[PDB]
Amino acid sequence: GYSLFPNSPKWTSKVVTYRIVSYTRDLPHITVDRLVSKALNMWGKEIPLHFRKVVWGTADIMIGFARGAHGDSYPFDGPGNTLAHAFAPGTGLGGDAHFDEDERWTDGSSLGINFLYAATHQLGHSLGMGHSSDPNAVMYPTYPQNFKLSQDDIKGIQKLYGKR
Amino acid sequence: XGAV
Ligand SMILES: [Ca+2]
Ligand SMILES: [Ca+2]
Ligand SMILES: [Cl-]
Ligand SMILES: [Zn+2]
Ligand SMILES: [Zn+2]
Numbered sequence: 497g498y499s500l501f502p503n504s505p506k507w508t509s510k511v512v513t514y515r516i517v518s519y520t521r522d523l524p525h526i527t528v529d530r531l532v533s534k535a536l537n538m539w540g541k542e543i544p545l546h547f548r549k550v551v552w553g554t555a556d557i558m559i560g561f562a563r564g565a566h567g568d569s570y571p572f573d574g575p576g577n578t579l580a581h582a583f584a585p586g587t588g589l590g591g592d593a594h595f596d597e598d599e600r601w602t603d604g605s606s607l608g609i610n611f612l613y614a615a616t617h618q619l620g621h622s623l624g625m626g627h628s629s630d631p632n633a634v635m636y637p638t639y640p641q642n643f644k645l646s647q648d649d650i651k652g653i654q655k656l657y658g659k660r
Numbered sequence: 661x662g663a664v
Contacts, residue, residue, distance in 0.1 A: 501664060570663060581661040621662035 498635060498652025499626025501584040506624045506656050513550045518560035522601040522608060532559055535615035539623050542650050543657035557622050558592040572596040580614055582621035593618040604641055613640035624656050
């Protein structure tokens, strides 16, 4: 079933900040904001962890769209291959979630990678979830239109943070 | 992709 990261890195503070730093041409800004909040609350509502949205500076969870190299030693690679990636909880790049601007992203109303599912998967990583062996799990390693966290996803996050 |  679920994986965490080696040594179970987790947020140590009651409150974790997150910033949507950069946006996609594919969607309105507010749509990315509301889908990220939704992706975070899907994990959030299961655990004793609270997210505060910040609109400037460095937050614990830096979220954005990037083309190619974007300062974290894991450059994006243009259309296809890598779609997105994220870092386990930690200082600096820890917690950060990046989306490759050279794919196509949708809110579900158009063609594209479903951004809500993608953001739920990457922010799983941001909170300390590894890849699940369970195909139903959002944290399954391969890529959505109508979904929720699986019982494996809930089990894993609650094992790392506790319930409620 | 999950990195450290
Ligand atoms: Ca960070
Ligand atoms: Ca790519
Ligand atoms: Cl399930
Ligand atoms: Zn990156
Ligand atoms: Zn992943």
